[PDB]
Amino acid sequence: ESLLNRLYDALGLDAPLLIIDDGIQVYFNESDHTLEMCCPFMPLPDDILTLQHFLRLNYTSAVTIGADADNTALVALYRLPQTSTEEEALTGFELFISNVKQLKEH
Amino acid sequence: MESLLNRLYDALGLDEPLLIIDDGIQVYFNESDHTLEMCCPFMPLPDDILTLQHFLRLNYTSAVTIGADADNTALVALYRLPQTSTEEEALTGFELFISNVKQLKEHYA
C-alpha cells in the first residue's frame, strides 16, 4: 500500500494529479522512496530579487519553492519518505495546501 | 531534558553559536520552536538570473532543500528535522545530510 494511496484513503478520496477549485493543482511524485507533493503556483520569474526572495523563503519554510523541469513555473514542494505513516501524510497534505494559498496571496 | 541540538553536539563529541567543519563541509544550525535546521553554506549567493533559476530547478530534483541565508550572502543546502526527533535520528540525519551536501557541492558548486 503506497503512501500516496494511503493519503487518498485518509482524505476520503477515491481515485481509480489532484485539482481543487481553490485554483490549485497538486501533482504527486513517488520516486526515490519518497512522496513528493508539487504545485505550480505562478510563472517562473526573470527578476533577480524575486528569484532570491523565493530561495530565501526556502531557508525557513517547511514547504519549499522550486522550478519545474520545463522551466515554465515556480512550484511549491513538500516531501515525505514512503516509510511515513498515513497520519504523517495527511498532516503534510494539510500543511501543503495552506502554504500554497499563502503563496498566492497579495 | 536536554535539547535535541545539545544531544547531537554530545553525539559529535562536543562540549552558543557554533560552526562545524566536516570534510571541508561547513555546517551550522538554525532553530525555530518546532524545528532544528541543519545548514551548509556551499557557495556565495549567485546574482545572475540563469544560475538562480537553475538552483530553483535543482530544488525540484535534489534530495536536500536549497535556499539562501537571511543575509543574502550564501546559497545554502539544508535539512529540517522535528525538534521532537530522537537523538539517533538527529545524528543519522546529520550524517546523511553531510553525504548529500558533499555530492551537491562537488557537482554544482
- Cell numbers 523565493 correspond to A54
Task: Give the residues after which the backbone of chain B is interrupted, taking a C-to-next-N distance over 2.5 angstroms as a break.
Answer: 15
Q: Check A74 against B68: CB less than 8 A apart.
A: no
Cα(B99)–Cα(B109) distance, integer angstroms? 15
Please report which helix (H) or strand (E) contains residue B105, including its range: helix B87-108
- Give residue A4's identity as a one-letter amino acid code: L
CATH classification of A1-106 is 3.30.1460.10, yes or no?
Answer: yes
Alpha carbons A61 and B43: distance in angstroms, whole number: 21
Residue B1's contacts (CB-CB under 8 Å, 6 or more residues apart) are: none
User: In 10 A of CB A23, how many CB atoms?
Assistant: 10
Domain range summary for chain A, segments of one domain joined by +:
1-106
Residue A14, H or E segment: none
Going B50 to B25 to B98 to B94, the CA torsion angle's sign is: negative
**What are the distances in angstroms from CA A50 to CA A13, A47, B42?**
36, 5, 21
Backbone phi, psi, residue A85, to 5°: -90, 170
What single letter denotes the amino acid at residue B3?
S
φ, ψ of residue B81 in degrees (nearest 5) = -130, 130
Cβ pair B76, B39 in contact under 8 A: yes
Sorted by sequence, the CB contacts under 8 Å of residue B63 that are 6+ apart come out as A32, B100
Chain B residues closer than 8 Å to A60 by CB = 30, 32, 37
Task: Report yes or no: A100 and A63 within 8 Å, Cβ to Cβ.
Answer: yes
Q: CB contact, 8 Å: B55 with chain A?
A: yes
SS3 B2: coil
Number of neighbours of residue A87 by Cβ within 10 angstroms: 10
**Distance between CA atoms of residues B98 and B45, nearest Å:** 20
Phi, psi of B49 (to 5 degrees): -55, -50
Q: Tell me, what amino acid is at A66?
A: G
Residue A43, helix vs strand vs coil = strand
Which option is the CATH number for B2-109: 3.40.640.10, 3.30.1460.10, 3.30.360.10, 3.90.550.10? 3.30.1460.10
A55/B66 Cβ within 8 A: yes
Q: Which of B19, B63, B62, B56 is nearest to B41 (CA)?
A: B19
Calpha distance B5→B8 (Å, rounded): 5
Cβ-Cβ contacts under 8 Å for B35 (sequence gap 6 or more): A62, B80, B81, B82, B83
- What is the C-alpha separation between B95 and A6, in angstroms, rounded? 29
Distance (Å, rounded) from C-alpha B76 to C-alpha B74? 6
Q: How far is CA A26 from the centre of its chain?
A: 6
3-state SS class at B42: strand
Where does residue A92 fall: left (phi above 0), alpha (psi -120 to 50 degrees), or beta otherwise? alpha
CA dihedral (A84, B29, B42, B98) positive or negative: negative
Which of B35, B61, B72 is opposite residue A56, by nearest beta carbon?
B72
Compute, in degrees rounded to 10, the torsion defined by CA atoms A7, A11, A13, A14.
Answer: 50
Q: By CA distance, what is B48's nearest residue in A? A: A48
Rg (CA), chain B: 14
